Design a protein around this ligand. Structure first.
Ligand SMILES: O=C(NO)c1ccc(CNCc2ccsc2)cc1
Ligand SMILES: [K+]
Ligand SMILES: [K+]
Ligand SMILES: [Zn+2]
Length: 639
């Protein structure tokens, strides 16, 4: 399986610029590329990526997305003086030309194709191309919005042609609408395009009626274009995450793409003068992380915009950090999306309910500027520690390790004297294991998480939970797959309990989420709907300092456990301890793999979830979203 992250960059692409005064074009400057690469070097991230050389896109490759007439016209700009370059630029909207931009445009496109080849050939797991000029406004026969050729559109067409891919997801988190990409694929059901964008009721550039939520695609492509317009500026981390949990992710995981391309413009970040949004650079670590379980991790990030040189550097680093597998930063202060965003989200979910299973229930009434510098993200020396049953060695990834100090055995003895009587000296070894593993996870930046096999559940959970609380980790999220009651107190806002079980138990209060799904062929899609629509929104708002996972010995969800384990590491900087009750070699090996940062096998498209399950899940949302507003995907009723 593949490893490493490509970083594709060439300082040649910084060698064109604006040659006349035009305050509207003043902001697209060569220093965007230098500052972004220099910031990756400063943080040691460029050095950890495989540098892959830039190349020129060939004429045949340019013609996958552009017309001969347009290519021939752009091919003449190297020979133009400034006057002729000005006259040529003015035939297009918000774009300037330079003697070297044709050269650089061919490099930006070839760079993008280099990234596609490295990922699809399994030479790297994923990667990023830092390119200029950007691509996503570019169209078959026109330059537009600083774009000459459509870098991302190239990549999807090239990947279709040369790797025979049937499903490609393009995520455009730039702050502008990538209409070039929408036009290119509006009739193609094999490319799914998602874009959020500053819109302001069509008053924001490019001022297009078809950037609205009602553009779903055309003909065979209906439902494979998703526009989420932002109708006010100042959108926050909560707005972006609500967009992911309630629009993009439910559709992406159902589409099940074979490759993910990101149109990664960072003008959607705080401080940018074009976007005027308020999302912190750290949010891009999570936008990246949330998409990485797709397509076995095959993800091509390509730079588009971003004009605040400071927030540009930081959001590029957060992105590459996440591509490299580094632990994600904690996101605090999450809440409801604002009313404007909830309206946009509700509107796109409704118009898309004809085409996607996660929105289907909406169709029938029977069912319906300065900001703090980001903290450091040092990867753990050994990411994952594992404690199998005694004397069971197993092939572990190069960054895992097996596990009892004298200090620890004293604590275990102390705890048993006071709270347990018990003398099964094996489940006493379990307690030294749990405590040894927990103390490495928290006291050390050298271990990130771990998994422990245990015999007796109740004493296991108590010591894990209590040792973590009294450590102190302010908040602990507990995710329990099994039935019955555990020694867990949802008494205060220090513990939130997610429980996935098989008996429908009434839910008391807003610090427990109990999911009882009907067992059958639909159990897998239901679990994914709950994960993306219920569990992740609450968990992100809760913001735990540790995640405690618990599986009782009984199989039925061996297919989704790796997706949950990967996604749940967006919380608590990845600090998760999993307790597996009883040895199960497959579940144990699956758990360690996802904890260790490995790629997760695709789910494939699965059987649509049972309506009874969706009913259960929306009753949970109704019950919890007044407390946990990141669960909202409709505007609330005013009094
Ligand atoms: O980053 C971008 N896209 O991803 C981006 C940024 C700025 C602009 C210019 N808009 C103002 C204008 C309209 C006519 S002339 C000047 C276009 C695209
Ligand atoms: K966009
Ligand atoms: K499409
Ligand atoms: Zn932009």
């Amino acid at each position: 399986a593949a490893s490493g992250s490509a970083l594709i960059f060439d300082e040649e692409m910084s060698r064109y610029k604006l040659l006349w005064t035009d305050p509207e074009c003043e902001i697209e400057v060569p220093e965007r590329l230098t500052v972004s690469y220099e910031a990756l070097r400063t943080h040691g991230l460029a050095q950890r990526c495989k540098a892959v050389p830039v190349r020129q896109a060939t004429e045949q490759e340019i013609l996958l997305a552009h017309s001969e007439e347009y290519l021939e016209a752009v091919k003449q700009t190297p020979g133009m003086n400034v006057e002729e370059l000005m006259a040529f630029s003015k035939k297009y909207n918000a774009v300037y030309f330079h003697q070297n931009i044709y050269h650089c445009a061919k490099l930006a496109a070839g760079a993008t194709l280099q990234l596609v080849d490295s990922v699809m050939k399994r030479e790297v797991r994923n990667g990023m191309a830092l390119v200029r000029p950007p691509g996503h406004h570019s169209q078959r026969s026109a330059a537009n919005g600083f774009c000459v050729f459509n870098n991302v559109a190239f990549a999807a067409l090239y990947a279709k042609k040369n790797y025979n891919l049937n499903r490609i997801l393009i995520v455009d988190w730039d702050v502008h609408h990538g209409q070039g990409i929408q036009y290119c694929f509006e009739e193609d059901p094999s490319v799914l395009y998602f874009s959020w964008h500053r819109y302001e009721h069509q008053s924001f550039w490019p001022n297009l009626p078809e950037s609205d939520y009602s553009s779903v695609g055309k003909g065979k492509g209906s439902g494979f274009n998703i526009n989420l317009p932002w109708n006010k500026v100042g959108m926050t981390n909560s707005d972006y995450l609500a967009a992911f949990f309630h629009v993009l992710l439910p559709v992406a995981y159902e589409f099940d793409p074979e490759l993910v391309i990101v149109s990664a413009g960072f003008d959607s970040a705080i401080g940018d003068p074009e976007g005027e949004m308020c999302a912190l650079p750290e949010i891009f670590a999570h936008l990246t992380h949330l998409l990485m379980p797709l397509a076995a991790g095959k993800m091509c990030v390509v730079l588009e915009g971003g004009y605040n040189l400071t927030s540009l550097g930081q959001s590029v680093c957060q992105t590459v950090h996440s591509l490299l597998g580094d632990p994600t930063p904690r996101i605090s202060g999450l809440g409801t999306a604002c009313d404007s965003a909830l309206e946009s989200i509700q509107n796109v979910r409704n118009v898309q309910s004809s085409y996607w299973s996660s929105f289907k229930h909406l169709a029938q009434s029977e069912t319906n500027i300065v900001w703090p510098e980001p903290l450091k993200r040092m990867p753990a020396s050994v990411r994952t520690v594992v404690v199998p049953p005694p004397g069971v060695e197993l092939t572990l990834p190069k960054n895992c390790q097996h596990s009892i100090s004298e200090s620890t055995a004293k604590e275990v003895q102390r705890i048993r004297d006071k709270h347990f009587d018990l003398t099964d000296q094996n489940i006493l070894r379990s307690l030294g294991n749990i405590i040894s593993v927990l103390d490495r996870m928290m006291r050390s930046d050298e271990v990130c998480n771990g998994c422990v096999v245990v015999s007796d559940l109740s004493v296991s959970v108590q010591c894990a939970l209590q040792h973590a609380l009294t450590e102190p980790a302010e908040r602990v999220l507990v995710v329990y797959v099994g039935d019955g009651e555990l020694p867990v107190k949802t008494n205060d806002g220090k513990v939130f309990l997610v429980q996935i079980c098989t008996k429908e138990t009434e839910d008391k209060c807003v610090n427990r989420l109990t999911l009882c799904l009907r067992e059958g062929e639909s159990l897998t899609a239901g679990f994914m709907q709950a994960l993306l629509g219920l569990i992740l929104p609450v968990a992100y708002e809760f913001n735990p300092a540790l995640v405690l996972g618990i599986v009782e010995e009984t199989t039925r969800l061996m297919r989704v456990w790796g997706h949950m384990t990967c996604l749940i590491q967006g919380l608590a900087r990845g600090r998760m301890l999993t307790l597996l009750q009883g040895y199960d070699k497959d579940l144990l090996e699956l758990t360690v793999s996802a904890l260790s940062g490995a790629s997760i096998s695709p789910l494939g498209p699965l059987r649509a979830p049972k309506p009874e399950d969706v009913e259960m899940m929306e009753k949970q949302r109704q019950r919890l979203q007044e407390r946990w507003g990141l669960l909202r995907c409709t505007v609330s009723e005013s009094w």
